From Swiss-Prot:
Disulfide bonds: C24-C66, C211-C253, C288-C306
One GO-annotated biological process of the protein: lipid catabolic process
The entry's keywords: Cleavage on pair of basic residues, Disulfide bond, Glycoprotein, Hydrolase, Lipid degradation, Lipid metabolism, Signal, Zymogen
Record-linked InterPro entries: AB_hydrolase_fold, Stereospecific_Lipase
Active-site residues per Swiss-Prot or TrEMBL entry: S107, D182, H219
Lineage of the organism: Eukaryota, Fungi, Dikarya, Basidiomycota, Ustilaginomycotina
Species this chain originates from: Pseudozyma antarctica
Catalytic reaction equation(s): a triacylglycerol + H2O = a diacylglycerol + a fatty acid + H(+)
GO molecular function annotation: triacylglycerol lipase activity
Name assigned to this protein: Lipase B
C-alpha cells in the first residue's frame, strides 16, 4: 500500500513535451487498440530497448506497443523520466476507451513505473499490471555520474523515498523477472526480499529458482531471453495479472534471445547493452544526486542531494 494520496503532483515538463516523448506502433495514443506501454532502461530510448524484443513480441501477442523515450537516453532525473510515463498512461487509458493497460519495463523502467504508481495516485486505476524485467527498486551496489545513475545507486535519496512511501510493495499486480547473475543490478542472488528486483506481494521470478543455480542470463538477457518471453507471456495473459508458475518450467529455460525474433532481431537483442554503455559514457554527469521533488522529500528526510540535506517539509 503506497502512502501518497490526493491530487497528482504537478509536472515540471509541459504536456506537449511529454506527449512528444510517446510513440505507438502504427497508431496514435489518442486512438489505440490494446496498447502496452514499454518503459526503457538507462542509456536507451524506447526503440533501443525494445526494437529487438518486446516491440515485435507484444505485437505478435495482439498488443499495439507504445513506448516513451525521455531525453537524454533515460540519463536525466528519474523523477522527470516518470512524468513521461504518467502522462503516457493517462493518454493511453483514455485513447483505448478508458481501458486499463499493461506496462512492461527493463531496468530503470521498472523503477520509473513503480515511482509513478507510488506518487501519482491517478494512474493506479489505469495500469492493469506491471511486467518488469531486471528492475532495480533498491538500486544497485555495483567522480561524476549521470543523474539517474546516482538515483539508482543503493542508499540513494530516490530509493529511500520509494521505500518509505510504501513502494517496495506491489501497487498493481506485478511480475518481476530477474537473474542472480545480473552484472548491472546487485544484490539479486538470494531469491528473497533482499533482491533489488523484489516487491512484496509481487510475483518475483528469479531465473535460477526455476532453471537451476547455474543458469546464466545477464542484465540484457533478463529482458530478451526465450525464458523471459515465456514468463512475460504468462504475466500478460494471466487472469490474476501476474505470471503463473504452471505456465513455465525447466523446458522453457532457454537463455538465447526469444525464438520468435528474426535473426536480425536476435543479433540486436544480444548486443542490447552496448549502445546503453556508450550513451552513459557521453551523457550528462554530476557529483551529487538530483534533488527530490517536493512530493517525495517527506520520505527521505536526512538524505543528501545536490542542494544539501533533506529537511522536513511544511
Amino acid at each position: 500500500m503506497a502512502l501518497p494520496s490526493g491530487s497528482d503532483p504537478a509536472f515540471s515538463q509541459p504536456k506537449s513535451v511529454l506527449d512528444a516523448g510517446l510513440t505507438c506502433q502504427g497508431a496514435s495514443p489518442s486512438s489505440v487498440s490494446k496498447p502496452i506501454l514499454l518503459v526503457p532502461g538507462t542509456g536507451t530510448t524506447g526503440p533501443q530497448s525494445f526494437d529487438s524484443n518486446w516491440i515485435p513480441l507484444s505485437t505478435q501477442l495482439g498488443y499495439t506497443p507504445c513506448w516513451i523515450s525521455p531525453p537524454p537516453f533515460m540519463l536525466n532525473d528519474t523523477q522527470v523520466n516518470t512524468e513521461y510515463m504518467v502522462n503516457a498512461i493517462t493518454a493511453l487509458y483514455a485513447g483505448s476507451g478508458n481501458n486499463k493497460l499493461p506496462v512492461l519495463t527493463w531496468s530503470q523502467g521498472g523503477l520509473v513505473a513503480q515511482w509513478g504508481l507510488t506518487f501519482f495516485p491517478s494512474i493506479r486505476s489505469k495500469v492493469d499490471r506491471l511486467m518488469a524485467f531486471a528492475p532495480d527498486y533498491k538500486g544497485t551496489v555495483l567522480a561524476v555520474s549521470a543523474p539517474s545513475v546516482w538515483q539508482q545507486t543503493t542508499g540513494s535519496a530516490l530509493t529511500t523515498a520509494l521505500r518509505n512511501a510504501g513502494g517496495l510493495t506491489q501497487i498493481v499486480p506485478t511480475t518481476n523477472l530477474y537473474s542472480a547473475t545480473d552484472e548491472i543490478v546487485q544484490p539479486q542472488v538470494s531469491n528473497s526480499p533482499l533482491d533489488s528486483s523484489y516487491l512484496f506481494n509481487g510475483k518475483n521470478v528469479q531465473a535460477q529458482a526455476v532453471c537451476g543455480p547455474l543458469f546464466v542470463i545477464d542484465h540484457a538477457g533478463s529482458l530478451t531471453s526465450q525464458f523471459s518471453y515465456v514468463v512475460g507471456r504468462s504475466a500478460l495473459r494471466s487472469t490474476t495479472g501476474q505470471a503463473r508458475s504452471a505456465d513455465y518450467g525447466i523446458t522453457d529455460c532457454n537463455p538465447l534471445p526469444a525464438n520468435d525474433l528474426t535473426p536480425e532481431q536476435k543479433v540486436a537483442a544480444a548486443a542490447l547493452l552496448a549502445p546503453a554503455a556508450a550513451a552513459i559514457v557521453a551523457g550528462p554527469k554530476q557529483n551529487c544526486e538530483p534533488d527530490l521533488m517536493p512530493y517525495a522529500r517527506p520520505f527521505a528526510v536526512g538524505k543528501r542531494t545536490c542542494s544539501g540535506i533533506v529537511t522536513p517539509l511544511e
